[model samples]
Target chain A: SKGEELFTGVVPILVELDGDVNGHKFSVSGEGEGDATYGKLTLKFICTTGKLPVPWPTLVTTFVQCFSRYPDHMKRHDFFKSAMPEGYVQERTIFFKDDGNYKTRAEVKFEGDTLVNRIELKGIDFKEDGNILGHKLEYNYNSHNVYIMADKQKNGIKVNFKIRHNIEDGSVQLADHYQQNTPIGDGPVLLPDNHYLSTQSALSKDPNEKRDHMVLLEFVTAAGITH
Target chain B: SKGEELFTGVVPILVELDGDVNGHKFSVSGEGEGDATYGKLTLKFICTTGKLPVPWPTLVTTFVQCFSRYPDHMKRHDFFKSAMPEGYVQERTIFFKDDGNYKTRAEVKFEGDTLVNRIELKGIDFKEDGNILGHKLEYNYNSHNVYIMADKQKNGIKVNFKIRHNIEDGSVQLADHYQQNTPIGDGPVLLPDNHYLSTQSALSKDPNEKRDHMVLLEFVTAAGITH
Candidate 1:
């Protein structure tokens, strides 16, 4: 077997820390080959001395800015689904935690038009303060739409949407079947009922034409159904 | 020359339709190549004849059912994001419309794990009705998270989330840059300010480890930030 199998099933382990940091646990896990890799990592921060270790937003924002650049740091990881056009020279700049205070920033550069990239952030100030820490962030798009990803911290978060395509055991449940007709305001006019229609490719004569025009025929049949 | 130049800009076009169908207009457009095909199609239905020409729900339902089979119809169209695992046998069966009335059914089989497939709707009854189109749809996820996509009909809606990676002209705008010192009691136990921290793949060092362990470092640093 090739060494490509070396990175498979590697669970994240806590390799380092600063000092006296307790009641917090962080880990990472991932598996993939080439451009089709996927993984999950997490961090949990808890205060044992009856106090908040860090302001919720501050802690979250800091981690957000830090993890945002991981994909670039690890050329093997392609986190962002690149929708940018070919030959597009672009970077991934993210503004994390804009709830007024306690913010962070990250910048990731693309390696040519390829998914591999680089991440960078300025020096951080983690001096212990009375409220643990204070910070800030900015920039927000209009209210049209927003895409938020899981944080990139040791205790950061991630999410995925499962689109199921199981047809072997799917069923259609219907209810209330009836027909009705009302008069047009005492004018002795009887109202009518709704009509239904559908169409499909002519399966009659030429089979080769049916194969060639199947997609087109489906659309036409759908139009008739709507009609 | 390479074949990559063949599918640069081919658009989808509809060739025909009928007249007198006022308050309604339908058209279709799309383009796709072997592995890099993406396109859009739509249908518009409107009736200004005071009375409902066909039951509104029925018209919508029929078309919905028609389009539902499309992904399978154009087996070459990998619309499900192609997350389906290899060697997996499945089909596309959708419950188009069920408002407790006349109903239909369809079943498709897998085309050897490739995206291509089939759709079949059992007989449908389009009898007319008065009011009582009473219906309900359940199982929407939650508040903090929601996934919204453009509608599939003519003049349909589309949405995009912009994640900018700008650094040169970006600034962190703080809403309320202040310190907080409070107690877990009714008394003013005077608290302290919050601190901030962030990290990245260190830009300068021997640079070899920086090159090989770069992505891994970014992720590790992100985990630290989330810390």
Candidate 2:
């Protein structure tokens, strides 16, 4: 209950990830986990981007902070069911570079106390040389839980691609192909804390003003920048 | 702000209504409104049933008490939008007697501070000889606010049916056709307070217990009591 109360004051943080799978570009922006009662939320993913704006370590820190107030002990199925109701199913439209408009659907369901995500992409492929018919991701929220079991087909072969968060902290275990070779080279570097605190203080002056739930931290590479 | 705090303590109460709309049998069970912080609430209509499980005036007293903390200044559009998000749409299935599984969808949208509800039936008509299709209700949480505008076709002629709630103690006002003869008749019926306290006391003993967000309070008439 205390944890829930603490969650009530937490604000949502934006998380942006841009990379490529099998050389096909992808970009995602979504509300990272944050305290309850904090802000509005939505998930948006695009199909063209191969670089992250912020450095990997800073991104990972923000990602970890998202769940700072999330109670780890809330491992009961009913807890997930109540927190994540059956009525919530979110849909997003993905704008692909040079291609037409595509759609995606996402749902959060509980398998025991573990929170599971089911993301369905309507029109896209993970590989260019081979026709990647479609892609689906199923994963959970845990330490280094960014590894996604990607359902994709290439050429005439059906393959399960492993897409992962290329965190520099070694917290997330990377797939064989992605190990030590993130599409985005890591170095926005870091600034000291006082700078961050001053910036945050300036940002927090008008609490009444609505803040963007998501923000682009930095641009890591130019490889997948189609626009 | 205190009202919001009170709202946090309040839980959803399910109310079931089983009755006839022009001789067609229908039943709907969904959340009403209630509280643990004390208050007045009503189970207004129970066709042919004279009283509540709690005393009538006492129930009214409790109902009024429930809203004692309800902030009255929350009349602004932004207030309503923030309190009831722009993305709040609820759907429920209406079980028709002797039919397989007929469903209806209800959507609630806010136009500024005004709450508008649109109910669409999927399989059946409200009338047998005529086709009574959908209903739209527009209201605010204020006195004399619940007005329904209905669309139906009779003999190939379209007609509008208006319905309103009539509360005796200046609480609910009735539309013209329902002025004197409510399908459920009237009396600010009495229900004993101890009975309610007893039931609720049993219900609230366990704070950790997950209570249903909604609960059915009374069955208006014995007419549609088809198990």
Candidate 3:
């Protein structure tokens, strides 16, 4: 069988930073061809302390610029998508707190042009000490959209990360949908609604005339994080 | 010489409206290919009374939709542009306004992606009655820009017709430019400065990748008459 069939599975990426130095040291790893050719690969930036470095924005700009030059990146991306599951959900009960599991479930869905992530925290509020809050907390929050503006114009492009309909501020439908939890010491921490993200990029055809996979990274770079 | 070299040059077109009672008949001359094999050529709309038809906008929409489908149209366009004089200027003097012509010379310069037209209407203000205004109206008015918006994105695609930096309503420099054409009645009528045009279209390469000749008619159609 062609190598294409022999190698198809998860691309595990592990980044380890072991050293003592000031701020995160900026760097990139690998030749970027670990997967298909033409600049498509898992790029790992393992700086000391495992954090992003300064001049990050410029780096993102430069990386996107470089990525865009890869004429076949789209095909490589499609190849990976074919090997992946369309959508999935994972649930777990982390009674591992020396105790009752957090009982949380996370899900992800993919559309032709959008990625949806829905997380549910509907399990007993188990304390760090393994104590049960007696009552369960059912909360659902999802507001992530990939924007195109997503540009300066009232229009939108490129693939961008943004939050359209925000989840909500602390409390109240974070009030209608979620009631103030009963007092329970050391309960599982939930992230604010501001955490949702999404992207909407525009695809155009050139001489070939196919509208498929037409997004380049430069357009994505300019598209801000909002609509 | 082969078929390619066998043909080249001006394509003459004639449209006459006789026994007419029409608001400009909406019909396209020839089967689009008076030249290339695809949908590329000089399309003439000769409605009765020499005016556009009612469903003009929708027709424009349909025309663009159809024109955009000529997959090889870009190649055909390149073929024509090659035969075209990269840029040109036409100057003429109608010394036959019955006599002292308005001596107007027009110029058009095309860049890799922009078209510039400059008209110099400098000469004796020849009158319809064959009388000179005794003075020349050295007026310069250029307010034409083909916007890309241009789109609703606040940013700016597609090609659009718009008037930027309009000349003036009536006059006064339409101010600083001219001290107001001396009141010369029966003088050569000058068009309001509200007429100037330009186009900026975006091009993107697809699976193959080459940024040449990428402005599609659809983009040109949507770009309203402004920036």
Candidate 4:
């Protein structure tokens, strides 16, 4: 409940480009804090501007914030069903009839980051249930020996959580139940330390103040920015 | 500020395909309220079903929310240099830059069916100057103006305002001298409404109460969902 808002700022120091594909080069030297607990996190994302911001911080943040349901749904399974199409949910899941039209799991995955703890997913489940609007992402979170499995079913109206125990135990430690209508948190999360550089340009006046930042994100794609 | 929270609550009744391209689908639907004061917009989107549920609201909202720099830069032709990969922002413009990044133009047309007066904006601009992080939508409370214009601009750090316009004729207006880092409330004549949306899901966890709808959008090169 008591979380600190990290990220003080980043000033552009240098900019460049790969000269091909995503042909924009950029760099930034900046300082900021991580989540309330990580204290101060030094940031940097220097590289050619690709699909991601030249640096990872801004792009990562944007993706995560915009795709909140993806991560949230990946936290469970039944919620996966809530993310399917109407006919599928009715045929495959239980709540399909009473919960109204729901979302199905289009696709989801954990984008491994050579730099930080990264998670990315595609095809989230957006469900419409009564007054609750929900999107459940399909993925998993792993740390140390603890593993979390999220499987969405019944059009994301239900999520089955699995916190696996040590191999020595072969037992389930914790299980979470999420209905299709679970809401997202209000604030932003903390990025890894020394992970990105941000440079923004002023673009607007009143009614809306617009700023475009060039960010560099370091990802672990086997194809390496070339599909 | 008094503007409707753009967040709509309701079950998306229709999932009809509006268009398609290259295997991706572009579409539009009626889900949210049509009321004007609150702007329960008729949203549109493009995306593939990753096997997930209805991806309309989430996809559409993400596309609209992330590409905030758009309409702002479109207002000023010279500002294009600072804009992100041109493809993403200038959906209808000619881009000399060839980056893999893709962007689209999205809008919520207020047909007056939703309100007595129709305020339509084919697009919105992302604006941010410090604690103020959001987009300025291009729209006219008046229904007669077909001359599309970008409304917001950021002059410097922590400062934003609207492009100057004549009060009497609604024509493009300008100032005598351009100084550095203009103040926040000076550029345009637009005033803050002071009202904000009370996000229930962001603040509470009743488990029973939920936000209205979610939309998913994608960009396609064709017309309608027949691709």
Candidate 5:
């Protein structure tokens, strides 16, 4: 009951894609907070994916940071069923965004040792996109979502996408499209300092591109943005 | 300066679909709220579209009640662009959902006469789907977003979707999804009673179904669920 409020001042965290995809080396940063404890966050983030390199929409496309959700359904035996059927509660959707209007809040409560959180969106302008557990994105809008699994263990994150909703389905649309559903996030775990940077899987580009790529996620968290 | 938090307790408002679609008489319900002022909103919403009739996924698919966001770009000429690039921020998504995990809070604040709010999502087990304005959703995830445009006007709402994200495109997958993009909502405005039930439009099922459908939205607002 003491948890009347969720996120306080917001711990600012910025993750990035600092590697190569399709042999194209580059860096794209995803900046946002892990909480909107106050309700309604301001989206000062800019979408400049058009400023990135060729076939490298990774800037605005690859990376999520200190938010919520732990979409585990994707790792299930049937990625289509348990992971689908959907909800901000059903779809097993992991991430969220702000459309500039209103939102259903993410309720944070302690369920035994685990924390159960929930939230939704409003307004006709807000929407969805992308898939990870593999790699990619910080949704723009004044919005986002989560379901944190914190046993204080440094674990890597997994992500998925819904083929429905007002979404884009970043499948082969990105670099290593296969990785979008290739059973990822079984590798390394996150660091305890709330910061870590290392190479993930090497993603293969489109068949027509004739080149593969590497994923490097630079995940770091703090109360504010120093970078 | 007195506003330190957002949604207080939850105001339960449940909308419904009461009419004939494809000549099938049905009255389904969409139960949820318009705000997550506390931080997170629980997704007591169930996905039982499997329980509905053939091709009528509207019970779980169509209808977004008291949430947030007022997607204005979809009203623009370049529908593909503004409604695309994507975001729980960029794609300019309208409605959101819950993944049963975590979510960034919807930052609520007063911007002049308008309410400027925002939020985002976290966790990897979660994701996205759908679109409206012309028609349809409450996203699934402990996740969703918003952008409220309030000017003391009881205007109609608009929605959009991204083809990317970890989403499911409800295009034609539901019913006559053309209203999914057709410029609509220019008609009747919401009532001050926060309650109104009437036939909004007549939706054509599908070119192949050999039958059309009528769309009826029962919008009502209250502190809790009754009837």
Candidate 6:
């Protein structure tokens, strides 16, 4: 059989870093062809005791920036949907407190020219003895087609996408959803997979000419892009 | 020549309505081969009414929505930018009360996975006797990407992306540079080229492999897309 058949169920794995120094050393692992548009990805880390404490915010920011060059990173993200059993409450959170475990699930979807995304992170205390600790923190955020501002001096911090809705009464309701959790914790922990899915094209019909237009975004590096 | 070069420019032509219609009537009339992401775009409009009497917020919504669809309409909007120029200036209180014109300009570039966009729109007050009008009205809005709260009844919207900057001091800067614009106005009239630039393959490297992972959104319509 061709390699495609043999590799159908094969999970992707990348041994990113291995070092005694601490802060947060990660073993990169994920599946899919690593296509910038749609694929599966995950990074797990085992923190050592002697390393500097890796702030939660720093970890989140690093992950965002790490995927910055991934043009459609914001369009689609999916995780735990297939990893965990149905009704297992798949979301990023403080599930393992015995050693301070952090779980984050992100998914991005690309539809036509716009991209939609969903992310959830939840953290709760759990003792090594299998006892449940009090709720430490829980946060979630969701957004659609929100642009990643290029002006670093102004809006550079990768943020949860904002969304708005028009209620039946004609009034507008705006709110935040997804994993906008405060990266307050310290230390290394294994993170779940970052799954993603997307729709590739936009169907545009010209009212005047009665002809349809197909639209797609071409990804190019700054150097390769034509002006 | 490579057959017939179909590339063309598309822009918004603004016209003022008399009587009950105080807002600008945008009549889409143009032919272009590319989309907002690529190609030269020039937007121009003129209204005899002032910004105060116009549709105000609704106008902006209408215009934005019209362009926002390009994201989902095109693959990644690889050939476009989110914002467009309206006009250089319009004289509603002074010059040609009956006839007027505005100009705009823009440049586009695409690298491996990034699209660089620059645009300008201006409205010239040609008529000395007409009032120079500038504000737009609200047209419409819709809520998207909703998620459930701990209390399922209370649903919230997902955040796709946001801009944030960091200062040397470490204090979070969400508002300073990004929000200062308070919704920027137009200074140049930029046009749109219907065709968008998109990658032919889903697997491609951005700036770096470990840094950026690209995604591909794939879809097919009832009859397929028409370029």
For B132-179, candidate 3 gives per-residue lDDT tens digits of 232222222233343221112321112323211222244221111110
Q: What's the TM-score of chain A alone for every prediction?
A: 0.21, 0.25, 0.22, 0.17, 0.28, 0.22
Interface RMSD of 1: 18.8
Residue B100 error, candidate 3, Å:
51
Return whichever of 3 and 5 wins on lDDT: 5
- Model 2 over residues B50-99: C-alpha lDDT tens digits? 21211121111111111222222211111112223232232333332222
For model 6, what is the C-alpha lDDT against the true structure?
Answer: 0.24
**What does candidate 4 score on TM?**
0.19
lDDT of model 6, residue B148: 11
- The candidate, 2 or 3, that scores higher on DockQ is 2
Q: How many pairs of residues collide in each model?
A: 31, 27, 35, 102, 161, 134
DockQ of each: 0.01, 0.03, 0.02, 0.01, 0.01, 0.03
Cα lDDT of all candidates, in order?
Answer: 0.20, 0.25, 0.24, 0.20, 0.24, 0.24
Candidate 5: list runs displaced more than 4 Å.
A1-227, B1-8, B30-35, B39-51, B54-58, B69-157, B162-227
Worst 10 residues of 4 chain A by lDDT: A218-227
Tens-digit lDDT string for candidate 1 (B1-227): 12122223432211111111122222211111122222222322223233333223222212211111111123222112222211111121212222112222212111332222221222222222322121121111111111112223311212111111112234211111111111112221111111121111111123443221101111010011110
Better of 4 and 6 by DockQ: 6
Candidate 2 per-residue lDDT, tens place, A29-78, comes to 54423333322222222222434322222222122111221222211111
Output the better candidate (1/2) by DockQ.
2
Mind giving the per-residue lDDT tens digits that candidate 5 earns over A80-176?
Answer: 1111112112112212233212212222223342223332322222222223212333221111121222122322222332111112343222221
Question: What shift in Å separates residue A77 of candidate 3 from its native position after superposition?
Answer: 22
